[PDB]
Amino acid sequence: MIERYVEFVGEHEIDAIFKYAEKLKDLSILHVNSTAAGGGVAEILHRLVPLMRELGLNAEWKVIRGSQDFFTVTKSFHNALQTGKGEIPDEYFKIYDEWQEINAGEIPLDYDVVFIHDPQPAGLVKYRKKGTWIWRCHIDISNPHPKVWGFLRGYISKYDGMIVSIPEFARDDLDIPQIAIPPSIDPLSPKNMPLPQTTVDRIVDKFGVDRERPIILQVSRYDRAKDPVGVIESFRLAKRHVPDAQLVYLGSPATDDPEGEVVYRETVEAARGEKDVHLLMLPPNSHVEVNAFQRAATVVMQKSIKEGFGLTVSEALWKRKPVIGGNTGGIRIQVINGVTGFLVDSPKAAAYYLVYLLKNKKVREEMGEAGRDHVRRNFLITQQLRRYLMAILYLTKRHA
Numbered sequence: 001m002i003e004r005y006v007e008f009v010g011e012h013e014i015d016a017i018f019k020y021a022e023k024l025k026d027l028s029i030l031h032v033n034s035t036a037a038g039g040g041v042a043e044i045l046h047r048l049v050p051l052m053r054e055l056g057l058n059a060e061w062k063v064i065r066g067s068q069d070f071f072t073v074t075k076s077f078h079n080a081l082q083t084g085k086g087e088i089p090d091e092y093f094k095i096y097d098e099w100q101e102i103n104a105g106e107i108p109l110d111y112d113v114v115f116i117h118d119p120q121p122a123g124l125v126k127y128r129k130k131g132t133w134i135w136r137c138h139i140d141i142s143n144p145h146p147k148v149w150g151f152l153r154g155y156i157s158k159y160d161g162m163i164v165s166i167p168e169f170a171r172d173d174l175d176i177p178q179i180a181i182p183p184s185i186d187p188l189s190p191k192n193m194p195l196p197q198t199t200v201d202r203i204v205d206k207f208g209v210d211r212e213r214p215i216i217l218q219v220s221r222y223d224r225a226k227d228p229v230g231v232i233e234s235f236r237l238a239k240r241h242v243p244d245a246q247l248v249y250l251g252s253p254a255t256d257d258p259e260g261e262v263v264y265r266e267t268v269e270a271a272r273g274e275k276d277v278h279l280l281m282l283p284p285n286s287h288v289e290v291n292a293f294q295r296a297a298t299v300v301m302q303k304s305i306k307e308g309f310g311l312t313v314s315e316a317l318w319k320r321k322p323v324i325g326g327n328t329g330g331i332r333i334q335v336i337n338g339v340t341g342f343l344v345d346s347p348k349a350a351a352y353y354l355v356y357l358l359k360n361k362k363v364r365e366e367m368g369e370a371g372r373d374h375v376r377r378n379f380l381i382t383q384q385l386r387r388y389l390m391a392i393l394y395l396t397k398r399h400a
């Protein structure tokens with residue numbers, strides 16, 4: 001598999017990966033996160049952990065378990081860290097700590113390297129043996145709720161190091177190494193692989209979307225952070241000027257996200273009257289269906305209020321789609337304003353750029369080529385893999 005990436009990134013990146021992998025042959029590595037079920041962290045680890053194994057690394061991946069209440073508490077911590085807002089009962093921290101204890105009993109932690117992904121398992125460091133512990137933060141912690149952050153920083157300060165997706169998430173109030181490594185797409189995964197036009201046509205038609213007219217696509221959960229209501233608004237404002245245009249909102253549920261409906265109803269409401277709005281809800285691991293819709297799209301949106309990175313952006317740029325992205329978090333390192341897409345602070349701004357891109361075919365096409373090249377140079381899985389191997393070599397040598 002790893003030799004297949006030379007086509008994209010060249011022989012020098014691949015040789016470096018082998019050289020780093022050689023130095024790490026005798027370390028065991030554990031990844032712990034909140035879901036294998038699909039999207040985001042699971043989607044990365046489903047490609048990344050097997051690549052680590054192909055390079056001869058003893059890499060394992062274990063998923064924590066919880067009650068509906070546990071995921072209620074962790075979803076509230078997530079929103080509180082990203083928005084700086086929310087009322088957090090004292091009971092939330094007790095539920096959290098109790099489910100750390102339960103998982104610690106059921107997950108062996110005797111590894112040379114332990115990667116803990118995101119806040120849900122951060123408390124497992126209480127039960128650490130003598131290996132190197134790395135907190136992999138996927139979310140925006142730039143301006144967090146002081147009580148939720150104060151609590152979490154209690155655990156984070158005990159790690160050997162920490163990975164954030166962009167430098168802007170690095171914390172002034174931590175002394176441990178903070179390394180900025182963005183997530184990545186696998187260009188050979190079912191999400192990103194080339195499809196024949198037949199496959200694209202099949203899937204777009206199946207869902208009752210007109211292939212012969214322009215499609216505006218957002219791939220995202222029905223989550224307030226992705227602002228589905230604001231996407232509909234953007235589309236409604238643009239639709240006056242581009243009457244042939246259709247909106248497809250392609251959502252899926254998340255194992256650690258119980259707050260996934262009512263927003264759907266609000267979205268349905270904001271959609272009422274417009275027949276060219278398609279609010280789709282697909283199973284997780286509908287990767288080829290997402291692929292098809294991204295290739296079918298004329299313009300892609302990721303109009304997030306908050307976003308750690310937004311893999312949906314690089315997925316669209318790779319397929320040569322311009323992206324209108326929320327001016328926030330890791331969207332800003334993928335969407336280079338006027339080059340790979342446009343950054344927006346409101347639905348009204350999004351509408352202006354929707355009409356611009358739909359009226360300017362050569363500009364759209366150029367932006368798409370610049371998007372793919374920007375992802376080829378920055379956001380492919382071999383770069384993330386190479387930088388992870390370097391972080392492990394760096395931090396294990398500091399630990400020992």
Ligand SMILES: OC[C@@H]1O[C@H](O)[C@@H](O)[C@H](O)[C@@H]1O
Nearest residue numbers: 034039040041118138254256
């Ligand atoms: O640790 C939280 C995780 O964050 C990712 O961005 C997201 O794709 C997953 O659905 C999950 O919520």
